[PDB]
UniProtKB/Swiss-Prot annotation, chain A:
It comes from Salmonella phage P22. Belongs to the p22likevirus portal protein family. It is found in: Virion. Homododecamer. Interacts with the terminase large subunit; this interaction allows the packaging of viral DNA. Interacts (via C-terminus) with the head-to-tail adapter protein gp4; this interaction participates in the head completion. Interacts with the scaffolding protein; this interaction initiates procapsid assembly, thereby ensuring incorporation of only one portal ring per capsid. Interacts with the capsid protein. This is Portal protein. The lineage of its organism: Viruses, Duplodnaviria, Heunggongvirae, Uroviricota, Caudoviricetes. Forms the portal vertex of the capsid. This portal plays critical roles in head assembly, genome packaging, neck/tail attachment, and genome ejection. Procapsid assembly may initiate with a nucleation complex composed of portal and scaffolding proteins. The portal protein multimerizes as a single ring-shaped homododecamer arranged around a central channel. Switches upon genome packaging from an asymmetrical conformation in the procapsid (PC-portal) to a symmetrical ring in the mature capsid (MV-portal). This change of conformation may serve as a signal for headful packaging.
Length: 48, 48
């Protein structure tokens, strides 16, 4: 009988997936033209 | 329609058309001498 390494709950691992995906959605604004004037037309139109 | 309130009225209408499925714009009456059409009286497109 010997010490066994800390596993860390499966809840921590499952919640990390939801954390990274939450940011990943809004990081994309949509693409309608590559790079400039993709989803950012809505930002650029009100600027001008 | 040089004034941006006309252009913004269209941009607002198409935004709410996608979101809630209802958007709109109206037409009003005012005096412009900084862009007169005739008689120093113009009509303008106000946003809803």
């Amino acid at each position: 009988a010997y010490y066994e390494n800390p596993e860390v709950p499966q809840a921590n691992a499952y919640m990390l997936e939801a954390a990274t995906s939450a940011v990943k959605e809004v990081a994309t604004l949509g693409v309608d033209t590559e790079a400039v004037n993709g989803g950012q037309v809505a930002f650029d139109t009100v600027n001008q | 329609m040089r004034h941006n309130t006309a252009k913004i009225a269209v941009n607002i209408a198409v935004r709410e058309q996608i979101e809630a499925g209802v958007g709109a714009w109206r037409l009003v009456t005012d005096y412009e001498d900084q862009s007169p059409t005739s008689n120093n009286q113009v009509i303008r497109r106000e946003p809803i």
